[PDB]
A paper describes a structure:
We used an enzyme activity assay to assess the effect of tenovins on DHODH enzymatic activity. This assay revealed that a number of tenovin analogues are capable of inhibiting DHODH (IC50 shown in Fig. 1B and Fig. S2). We finally obtained a crystal structure of tenovin 6 co-crystallized with DHODH. This crystal structure demonstrated that the tenovins bind in the same pocket as our previously published compound, HZ05 (16) as well as brequinar and teriflunomide. Based on the crystal structure of tenovin 6 co-crystallized with DHODH, we decided to model the potential interactions of the tenovins with DHODH to examine the energetic favorability of the interaction. Our structural models were constructed using the apo-structure of DHODH and refined using extensive molecular dynamics (MD) simulations. The models suggest that tenovin 1 possesses the same predicted interaction at Gln-46 as tenovin 6 and that the reversed amide present in tenovin 39, tenovin 39OH, tenovin 50, and tenovin 50OH is not favored. Now it has been established that tenovin 6 has two additional mechanisms of action, DHODH inhibition and blockage of uridine uptake, along with the previously established targets SirT1 and SirT2 (11) as well as blockage of autophagic flux.
Numbering used by the authors: 33 to 395
Write the structure that this text describes.
């Protein structure tokens, strides 16, 4: 009924009438004022997950990039997400790339973007989160945690120092931080996934995190690309275990263009998201789980539009999942749809809950 309206009428009219950047801004705005259904799906106990030092009422989060500046957090919980990740936030404000910088590939259920870390900056986000800090503390306690994704400024001379500043400023306000070393849209950034660079960077990040007062001390995750070599994945796994990194977000967008893309805009520069990324992301989860012996929580992201999509990532090793791109095509009903289908599939496959399914394919 209501998922059939947004998918076939509203989203085709929103997206047909406005350029994707405009549409996204309007969506942030609407979401932030809480103009959504109100959201009817009541989360089953089957969907609760305990990971990263927190309870998650359900395992479906909004991926980084939808709410870059932390403006819509409460509306995103109201949409039925189990957890919200904001960002990426850069130390200083910066504008990002010139427009157009986001492209829909409706025939692929995909998006390409080259935003380039358009960010209001740490200070503005810090103030926005402080204004609701206690409210968030109650949400977290009730099983609705908040992640903050950190990036780096385009002209920064010292990448590690940018991330460290991010830890110092937003770490105290976050349940988890993400060291986003996987945007395809900032020159040299993905180099920070290499072994020696990554170890030096994360050492410094963890030190900064460790220097925060205990109730303000977040988990630290690293978000990785789907385009890594085997060598690069081996090396990340090694560093993450050596340093005690709390988890991985797997994956960012791809700079690949899988054969079969039909959208006219398929050769635009940027990162590809949505359904052509799905199985590349799933396979990256699968390998990172195996290389970390199932001991390092993974948040699985890339092309999730359904309960099956979510369960494939969980079974491959994700403790939690996120989605973004599906919202472009299905709108807010997709969240309840993913949850309901995931619950039914867990029951069908004989799992007592999401926790029992995590990594099941490896057992
Ligand atoms: C007639 N109306 C519009 C009001 C009707 C009821 C409320 C409502 O529609 N709310 C609402 C809330 C959110 C949305 N859309 C969402 S959540 N997302 C997007 O439209 C969107 C997401 C991502 C992108 C890019 C940047 C990836 C392309 C673009 C749009 C649409 C409608
Ligand atoms: C328009 C857009 C902007 C994004 N911005 C960011 C960001 O700032 N930081 C980040 O770590 N990931 C960013 N992502 C990546 C998503 O968080 C996600 O990793 C990727 O889009 C795969 O999930 P999806 O297929 O469900 O969209 C962005 C994605 C899109 C589509
Ligand atoms: C709020 C003061 C800082 C503004 C700096 C410019 C950041 C551009 C972010 C882009 N946009 C507003 C479209 O999301
Ligand atoms: O991490 C990121 C950053 C983003 C951008 O261009 O800002 N685009 C992405 O696809 N991933
Ligand atoms: Cl082409």
């Amino acid at each position: 009924g209501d998922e059939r309206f947004y998918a076939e009428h509203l989203m085709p009219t929103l997206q047909g009438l406005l350029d994707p950047e405009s549409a996204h801004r309007l969506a942030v705005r609407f979401t932030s004022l809480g103009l959504l259904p109100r959201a009817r799906f009541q989360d089953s106990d089957m969907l609760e997950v305990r990971v990263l030092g927190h309870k998650f009422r359900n395992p479906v989060g909004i991926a980084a990039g939808f709410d870059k500046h932390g403006e819509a957090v409460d509306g995103l919980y109201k949409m039925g997400f189990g957890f919200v990740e904001i960002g990426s936030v850069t130390p200083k404000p910066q504008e990002g790339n010139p427009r157009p910088r986001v492209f829909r590939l409706p025939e692929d259920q995909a998006v390409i973007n080259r935003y380039g870390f358009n960010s209001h900056g740490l200070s503005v986000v810090e103030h926005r989160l402080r204004a609701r800090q206690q409210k968030q503390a109650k949400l977290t306690e009730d099983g609705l945690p908040l992640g903050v994704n950190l990036g780096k400024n385009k002209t920064s001379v010292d990448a590690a120092e940018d991330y460290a500043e991010g830890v110092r400023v937003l770490g105290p306000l976050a349940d988890y931080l993400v060291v986003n070393v996987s945007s395809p849209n900032t020159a040299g950034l993905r180099s920070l996934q290499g072994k020696a660079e990554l170890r030096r960077l994360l050492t410094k990040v963890l030190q900064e995190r460790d220097g925060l007062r205990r109730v303000h001390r977040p988990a630290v995750l690293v978000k990785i690309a789907p385009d890594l070599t085997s060598q690069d994945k081996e090396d990340i796994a090694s560093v993450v275990k050596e340093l005690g990194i709390d988890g991985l977000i797997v994956t960012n967008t791809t700079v690949s263009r899988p054969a079969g893309l039909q959208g006219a805009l398929r050769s635009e520069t940027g990162g590809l998201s949505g359904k052509p990324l799905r199985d590349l992301s799933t396979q990256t989860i699968r390998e990172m789980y195996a290389l970390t012996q199932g001991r390092v929580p993974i948040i699985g992201v890339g092309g999730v539009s359904s309960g099956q999509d979510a369960l494939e990532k969980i079974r491959a090793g994700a403790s939690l999942v996120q989605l973004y791109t599906a919202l472009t095509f299905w709108g807010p009903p997709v969240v309840g749809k993913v949850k309901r289908e995931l619950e039914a599939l867990l029951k069908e496959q004989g799992f007592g809950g999401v926790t029992d399914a995590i990594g099941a394919d490896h057992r």
